[PDB]
């Protein structure tokens, strides 16, 4: 290891993933297993990569105190055990799901998704992101307007209104 010369290191070096941070997630991992690194690191194979890091650095005094790069409301955002996660390339979508559709399956606590940066707020997960590049969600998103949204009601008077 090393003192300040090493402490400062883990800081700025990784805090760069905060200044120029794509997405953002804070998940504790009490009772985490190796699959913990056989997942966010496995999905990094044929659907991710070295573009993701969850360097458990909840040293707070290091992680939290180490975020002068504007991330207010975080003097609270850094409680107990933590394992921050950030992105560099790619979009700012998916990622939340790697956690949302993993930790939801036991896989240790998920900090109930305390939310992180980007919009900069508090706790209460969202998902308006992973719907990206799933353009067909913007396709049927018109609900055929005329069609479907019609053949669903304007023609429901027959299979549900003839008495």
């Amino acid at each position: 290891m090393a003192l300040n010369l090493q402490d400062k290191q883990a800081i700025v070096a990784e805090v760069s993933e905060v200044a120029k941070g794509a997405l953002s997630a804070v998940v504790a991992d009490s009772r985490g297993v190796t699959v913990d690194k056989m997942t966010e690191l496995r999905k990094a194979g044929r659907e991710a990569g070295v573009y993701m890091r969850v360097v458990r650095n909840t040293l707070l005094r290091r992680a939290v105190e180490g975020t002068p790069f504007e991330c207010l409301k975080d003097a609270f955002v850094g409680p107990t055990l933590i394992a921050y996660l950030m992105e560099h390339p790619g979009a700012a979508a998916r990622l939340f799901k790697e956690f949302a559709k993993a930790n939801a399956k036991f896989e240790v606590k998920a900090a109930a998704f305390e939310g992180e940066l980007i919009p900069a707020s508090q706790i209460d997960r969202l998902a308006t992101l992973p719907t990206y590049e799933e353009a067909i969600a913007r396709l049927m998103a018109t609900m055929k307007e005329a069609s479907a949204g019609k053949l669903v009601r304007t023609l429901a008077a027959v299979r549900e209104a003839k008495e």
Partner: peptide, 30 residues
């Protein structure tokens, strides 16, 4: 960009034209 009350009112396209704007709104795909 942000062309509000138009990209919408273009619904004059009517049904078959919307399937025309969807067939290709992906065409050459899955």
């Amino acid at each position: 960009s942000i062309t509000k009350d138009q990209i919408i009112e273009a619904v004059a396209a009517m049904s078959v034209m919307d399937v025309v704007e969807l067939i290709s709104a992906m065409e050459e795909k899955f």
